[PDB]
Amino acid sequence: SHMYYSYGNYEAFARPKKPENVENKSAYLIGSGLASLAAACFLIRDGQMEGSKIHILEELPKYVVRGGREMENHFECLWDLFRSIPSLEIDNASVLDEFYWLNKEDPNYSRCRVIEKQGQRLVTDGDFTLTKTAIKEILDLCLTNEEDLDDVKITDVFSDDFFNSNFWIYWKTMFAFEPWHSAMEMRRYLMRFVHHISGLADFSALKFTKYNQYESLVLPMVEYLKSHGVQFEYDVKVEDIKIDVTTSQKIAREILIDRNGNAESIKLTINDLVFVTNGSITESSTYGDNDTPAPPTDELGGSWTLWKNLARQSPEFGNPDKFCQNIPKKSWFVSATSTTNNKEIIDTIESICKRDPLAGKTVTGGIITINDSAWQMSFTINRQQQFKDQPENEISTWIYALYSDVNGDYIKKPITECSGNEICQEWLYHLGVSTDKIEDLAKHASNTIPVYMPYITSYFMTRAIGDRPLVVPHQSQNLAFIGNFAETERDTVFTTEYSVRTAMEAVYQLLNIDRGIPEVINSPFDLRVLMDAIYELNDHQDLREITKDSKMQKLALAGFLKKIKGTYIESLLKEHKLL
Amino acid sequence: SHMYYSYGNYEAFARPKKPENVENKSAYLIGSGLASLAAACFLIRDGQMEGSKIHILEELPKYVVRGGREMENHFECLWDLFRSIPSLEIDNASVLDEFYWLNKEDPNYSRCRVIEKQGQRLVTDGDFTLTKTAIKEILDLCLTNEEDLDDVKITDVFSDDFFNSNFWIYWKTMFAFEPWHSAMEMRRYLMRFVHHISGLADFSALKFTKYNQYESLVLPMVEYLKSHGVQFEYDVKVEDIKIDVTTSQKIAREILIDRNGNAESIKLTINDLVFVTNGSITESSTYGDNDTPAPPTDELGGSWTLWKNLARQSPEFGNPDKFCQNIPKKSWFVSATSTTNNKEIIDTIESICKRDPLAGKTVTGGIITINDSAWQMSFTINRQQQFKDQPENEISTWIYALYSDVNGDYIKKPITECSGNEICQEWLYHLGVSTDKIEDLAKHASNTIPVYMPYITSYFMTRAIGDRPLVVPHQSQNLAFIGNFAETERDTVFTTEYSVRTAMEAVYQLLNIDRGIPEVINSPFDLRVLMDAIYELNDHQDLREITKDSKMQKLALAGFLKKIKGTYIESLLKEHKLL
């Protein structure tokens, strides 16, 4: 046991000893992603490794919004990391200090969630409209083991009652889930955010940064790492890492890189740690403009080629083909972001979200789902402005579509064939804007940049156990896997927390840092949390109202209330407004 | 709602804003106890109050062991406080840093717990020997509401099966419980440490400081407070505080003090906060020596007189007479500490606890209970030495007796009438030392100092709701109550955490500090914790073994396993070794 999980304030504020033999250890980190930079920060702080021994290998040499970066308070590893990171906006404060102070003065909540029939709000908005069978299937999915859910789709565990409910409309749009996605990952998502079911439709439990994650999270970490002398090597293309797999131990021996076009090799010892971010969801992302579509592609990038080369060496390094291959053509591929300063587009937006987009505060509270759209278009507007040099009179909205190969409503073309204005054409169509001024507002009054990510749905692909390698593989001495494609316990991918948690576990295991890693929050194992979930799932109903029709549950409930009458259980039932 | 509870790493590392109008606010703190000094530290750190505006009023002008200061990892408020406090032993570290590092290199566990028949270990040691009815009564106490347990004794909720079990032997000695004590406080104790039931007999869950709490906790806080310029006024005897109770608000207007023998008054405004530690368990503590007993007394001290004077002003300031009056004469009154360097006394101690007392590490793992002693004597030896100038060849043991008016085994006198050597006489009697060298080893080879605390059992006295005032009373502007006699939610008195938690809540409510106060740990509301408790309570038995005799439970269990077969519940049952 090279690590142990923990919770509470004891292991939270505790600093570990400097681990043994660190001063003769180095670290090479492939990529400059969020998980890679988090691992370097943990090596500096918790591992007490000097910055000159840490190398960041970056492929690239020395307005687009990557939306969907929702955050919540129980990102235990993220706030453990973003504590010693000083901020760049205000002095004598951390990244968490600004995030705490900004989310307490302007709480995030959505006054409108789903609209349909070109602008009109959904009549059953706020309610989940989950039937008894839909709630049963939700419980059945959570009560099934993770081992029994290997290569199981969402449609294999849910019926047509679940998909017709408003709960699925919120769930499929908040997390960009698809019906052909992993049931293991969805089951992890239901258990992780079971305490946010009350704040699910109105987004009251969601927390947002002042800007995008690049300048709110990545840039503060870059400034922190550069202050400690962390070496950043650029123009480095990592082909493959030579691993010798013996029956007793596995050591990274050598890395083949392409340093500024010249292929050369770095030698490795047992002390020289290697951190690999296998796979990438932003790789091979073609871009478009307001007049031409983003060209579709399926070219495997550097991150996917490295994982394929590593997987051939050992079977327990994971299967990269289960994520980067055979992605359905109906999956989410194209996302667009539109920037405008035109008044009547903003006025239409204000008429739907009931808040001023130029006020500088929470605008939409999150995303807005177009239920009638054939593309399953969903758009969001964050606290404008999300950028530094962006003018104060301009707003930036982010648009993504779930289905890809279906013709749109106003434009009879798929999202893959529509240019930047044409995506903005149908977006204005569903906002209630008339079909006469719709054309010139997109082509001239707004600038929309499409982007085609062919791997933006890879983390939710159906997988088995062992398809994702362990964060530190078994019997591994200096090789670690970080990012959203590394296997850990009970955590949800496509979150900033998952990348940070994998970074923390990799550093703590390889360096044998004897400090408790903060476990995933115990909401699914909490009596109070599970009771609040039952109340919220069936549209704010007491136990008498939930079982008012079924006789088998009514008899069982009557015996239950008889045995708990005048007890602390009944007090728990009443204070959670279930009785 | 002037405060809110929270948990997790978000509110743990978050620093609050400087609260409004603080720079015109002052603070007067009565007493220099653990709770009082904790409140001053919170005012400096979280309240950002300058030290010159904080006053500590101390009655006193400018080897004894106060044993029983067990600590555990989930003292959430204590580690929140002892984080910014720098240590005095090692540099560039906090009090928590040393505590974390010392308790990970030398884990605390007891190789012997209960001895009887003059030295021999209990045959059923480690086991709880709780019957089915005893486990039923334990569950019934935890499942009853706190409101229904007003003025309820321990004997009123438990039967003779519970008191004959080894669980009660450990419980009545770890926490110095008595059969005539508050069932509310015991129910809080069972729910608080329900996750430590596995580590209850062997003390594997207990954590200890390097020295006594005065030098490990109080002195680091004193040095921290003096570095910030906190004013310490000495020779100040607080008689009463003038409170005007209107229908809308209550304000501390004036405090009557006796400054160095001269009675004078300090005026108060709404901004001038007042923190009162009502009651004291160490007050009116008479001392003895190796030849004379500690003289018994019942004189109300300054802390009890202040609470009585405050209680007359308003009914919701609590009832001090329910704790300081009518304490039974069989209750714990006399404690002794014995210091020796004689070899054969140490050798006898090593022969029982199986560890060297002079090694500098964990010696007894906690306390040792004498089951055959009429006094219910229990003695402990911590990591020697517990003091600074104490020689390396000397050990210091702490002896307390639960029953007080009963004659001892070797000495036919009560503990109240026995001198320092005579307490050491019967202690050596139960260690297996022969009845020939027993006398001169206590009178000449050891020095034992008795102490008579008449209020060392007041916090466990039977109480109703409102007997203890709220930490901040309702409609109170500048008056707060801190310490073990203030009422808070779900926390256990006679712990360092309770004094710190009351200090944190008082500072956060009076100053309107908008940061989450860490709640009491959610062990009673955790599915995993409750399942481990069931396994440990019935002496490591599976559900088939627990219900192997009762037919009503056997039928219900068979239906339960049928409904959970091949589910995540069954996985939870197996991984908690309950199935």
Residue numbers in the entry:
A (entry chain A), B (entry chain B): -1 to 60, 75 to 591
Article passage:
pmcOleate hydratase (OhyA) is a bacterial flavoenzyme that catalyzes water addition to C-C double bonds of unsaturated fatty acids to produce hydroxylated fatty acids (hFA). OhyA purifies as a soluble homodimer where each bilobed protomer contains three functional domains: a fatty acid lobe for binding substrate unsaturated fatty acid, a flavin adenine dinucleotide (FAD) lobe for binding cofactor FAD, and a carboxy terminus of unknown function. Each OhyA carboxy terminus is a helical region containing two amphipathic helices (helices α19 and α20) that arrange in a helix-turn-helix (HTH) motif that sits above a hydrophobic cavity from which a tunnel leads to the active site. In this study, we found the carboxy terminus is a membrane anchor that enables OhyA to solve the topological problem of accessing its insoluble substrate in the membrane bilayer.
OhyA was spotted on a grid for cryo-EM analysis to study the dynamics of the solution structure. The addition of 50 μM lauryl maltose neopentyl glycol (LMNG) detergent dispersed the particles, cured the orientation bias, and enabled structure determination of dimeric OhyA to 2.61 Å. We observed multiple states of the OhyA carboxy-terminus in the 2D classes from the dimer dataset. 3D variability analyses can be used to detect conformational variability in single particle micrographs so we performed 3D variability analysis to measure the dynamic behavior of the carboxy terminus in solution. 572,989 particles were refined for variability analysis to ascertain the distribution of their dynamic molecular motion. 278,661 particles clustered within a cluster with the best density for the carboxy terminus, consistent with the crystallographic conformation. The reconstruction from the variability analysis of this state yielded a 2.79 Å map. The states primarily differed by the overall density of the carboxy terminus, but no discrete sub-class of molecular structure was observed. This analysis confirms the carboxy terminus is a flexible domain that can adopt multiple conformations, but there is no preferred conformation in the trajectory of the carboxy terminus in motion under these conditions.
